[PDB]
Amino acid sequence: SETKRAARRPYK
Amino acid sequence: DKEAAFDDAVEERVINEEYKIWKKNTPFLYDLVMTHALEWPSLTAQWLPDVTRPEGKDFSIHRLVLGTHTSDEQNHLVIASVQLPNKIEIEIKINHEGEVNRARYMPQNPCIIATKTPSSDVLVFDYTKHPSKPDPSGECNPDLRLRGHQKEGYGLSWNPNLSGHLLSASDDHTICLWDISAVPKEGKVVDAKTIFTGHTAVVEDVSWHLLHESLFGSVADDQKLMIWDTRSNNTSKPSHSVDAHTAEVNCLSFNPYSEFILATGSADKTVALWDLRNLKLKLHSFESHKDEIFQVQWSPHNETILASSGTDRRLNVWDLSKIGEEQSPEDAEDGPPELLFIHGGHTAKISDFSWNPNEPWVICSVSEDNIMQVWQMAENIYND
């Protein structure tokens, strides 16, 4: 899922 | 000019905005986040191995070796207690001459702690032999003073297979070794048993291999990683020497599950992965960090997980099992596939961190502004 993406984008 | 100050102000804004968006995302990115302002900044952090678990409690008590960094005031070697589920307190403050650059416990007896100061002596403390509350005179009464260096440094590493064998790296281009195994009853000062001189610049870090008692590694501002063997009768030249990075090398870590593997972290903004059986060829370069890296550490629980921290205020977590996976160019923008997590909670240079050895995924990181964070990323990020 895009929970992965958030992990690599702490500042967004 | 007044341009330097417009830049500073913009930069403050940047950091502040970033910290705002980080704070809103915490409930989605973490299972745990604690933040504590220490009295002084700590340059060092290490969890002690012990964990006590009082009856009828919904939490366990863990411990941390920390230090201070203060210019004008009395510095201390510090042990703090942290409560974790199944708050934070200072418990011992020991007078320390100058800031504590690094502090590390001896595995075979973790009451014993070695420190690195701004002076050249490497100190050993037994914290059970000092009062809980420090004498107001402010005198540093360390249990041993280890001599051999001419300058300060950071690297410090106890041999986990030969009790009392301590290695140290220094700005004087030297690695020193001591054996404090057996120390005469009138003896407080201990001279180096061996001094290694293969580097030609500031030696930044040193570490013993975990299985092979004779083996250890070093990294320096000469951009080199050096693999040394204590059995050798030549101390001016390592067994192996590689050109590791395109700038200073500040840190290294041997993988505790993969005896041929280690990582290094550098001012070139990368972490490099290495295989001892063939050092000509770097296995991999982990890219994402935006500025100089100071610390690198393998997970004590998972053989593929590695973390790094430094000057860009971030602590990155990596998983080598994903190296090579393909990705949409949208994901590719955020970083390579082996980047699992960017810890964005600090608003200053991170000075050191330590993976908790009893609670998987829990990390303690400390920054120059005096903040200590104890945190743990959300489970769904590393599992299914």
B130-143 in b/e form (b: 16+ CB < 10 A) is: beeebeeeeebebb
Pairing of strands B144-147, B189-191: parallel
* Alpha-carbon span B78 to B127, nearest angstrom: 9
- For CA atoms B73, B75, B78, B83, the dihedral sign is positive
CA distance B214 to B369: 39
- A4's enclosing H/E stretch is helix A3-7
Indicate the DSSP class of residue A7: H
Q: What residues pair up with B342 in beta bridges, in sequence order?
A: B316
At B238, which amino acid appears? P
Give the DSSP H or E segment for A1.
Answer: none
Nearest CA distance, A1 vs chain B (angstrom)? 9
- Which class for B365: exposed (0-12), middle (13-18), buried (19 or more C-beta within 10 A)? buried
Of B29, B378, B380, the CB nearest to A10: B29
Radius of gyration of chain B (CA): 21
Q: Taking CB atoms and an 8 Å limit, are B344 and A3 in contact across chains?
A: no
Confirm or reject contact between A5 and chain B (CB < 8 A): yes
| Interchain proximity B29–A4, CB inside 8 Å | no
Task: Say if CB B268 and CB B250 are below 8 A apart.
Answer: no
Number of Cβ atoms within 10 Å of the Cβ of B283:
14
Structure tokens that stand for B119 in this block: 């002076």
| Closest residue, chain A, to B18 (C-alpha) | A11
Chain position carrying tokens 């005096």: B370
DSSP 8-state symbol, A12: -
How far is it, in rounded angstroms, from Cα B381 to Cα B342?
Answer: 12
Residues 6+ apart with CB under 8 A from B366: B38, B41, B42, B43, B44, B45, B66, B350, B351, B352, B353, B372, B373
Q: How far apart are CA B115 and CA B96, in angstroms?
A: 9
Compute the distance between CA of residue B8 and CA of residue B181 in angstroms, rounded to an integer.
51
Residue labelled with tokens 């490497």: B122
Euclidean distance between CA atoms B209 and B260, whole angstroms: 10
The reply to whether A11 touches chain B by the CB within 8 Å rule is yes
Which of B63, B115, B53, B107 shows the shortest CA–CA distance to B85? B53
Domain limits of chain B?
1-384
Question: Which residues have a Cβ under 8 Å from the Cβ of B253 and sit 6 or more positions away?
Answer: B207, B262, B263, B296, B297, B298, B306
Contacts A–B by Cβ distance under 8 A? 40
SS3 A5: helix
What letter represents residue B30's amino acid? Answer: Y
Residue of A nearest to B316 (CA): A8
Decide if A2 touches B, using CB distance below 8 A: no
Query: Given CB atoms, is A9 within the 8 Å cutoff of chain B?
Result: yes
Length of chain B: 384
Cβ-based burial of B119 (10 A; exposed 0-12, middle 13-18, buried ≥19): middle
**Residue B135, amino acid:** D
Distance CA B112, CA B125 (A): 6
d(Cα B227, Cα B7) in Å, to the nearest integer?
Answer: 43
Number of other CB atoms surrounding residue B61 within 10 Å: 15
Q: Is the dihedral of CA B8, B344, B369, B272 positive or negative?
A: negative
Q: Measured between alpha carbons, how far is B211 from B230 in angstroms, rounded to an integer? A: 14
Is residue B337 less than 8 Å (CB to CB) from chain A?
no
Asked if B168 contacts B181 with a C-beta cutoff of 8 angstroms, the reply is no
Q: How was this structure determined?
A: X-ray
Asked whether the beta carbons of residue B378 and residue A10 sit closer than 8 angstroms, the reply is no
Contacts of B341 in chain A (CB under 8 A): 7-8
Q: What is the 3-state secondary structure (H, E, C) of chain B?
A: CCHHHHHHHHHHHHHHHHHHHHHHHHHHHEEEEEEEECCCCCCCEEEEEEEECCCCCCEEEEEEEEECCCCCCCEEEEEEEEEEECCEEEEEEEEECCCCCEEEEECCEEEEEEEECCCCCEEEEEHHHCCCCCCCCCCCCCCEEEECCCCCCCCEEECCCCCCEEEEECCCCCEEEEECCCCCCCCCEEECCEEECCCCCCEEEEEECCCCCCEEEEEECCCEEEEEECCCCCCCCCCEEEECCCCCEEEEEECCCCCCEEEEEECCCEEEEEECCCCCCCCEEEECCCCCEEEEEECCCCCCEEEEEECCCCEEEEEHHHCCCCCCHHHHHHCCCCEEEEECCCCCCEEEEEECCCCCCEEEEEECCCEEEEEEECHHHHCC
Q: How far apart are the first and last CA of chain B?
A: 53
| Candidate from A1, A5, A11 with C-beta closest to B21 | A11
**What class is the B1-384 domain?**
mainly beta
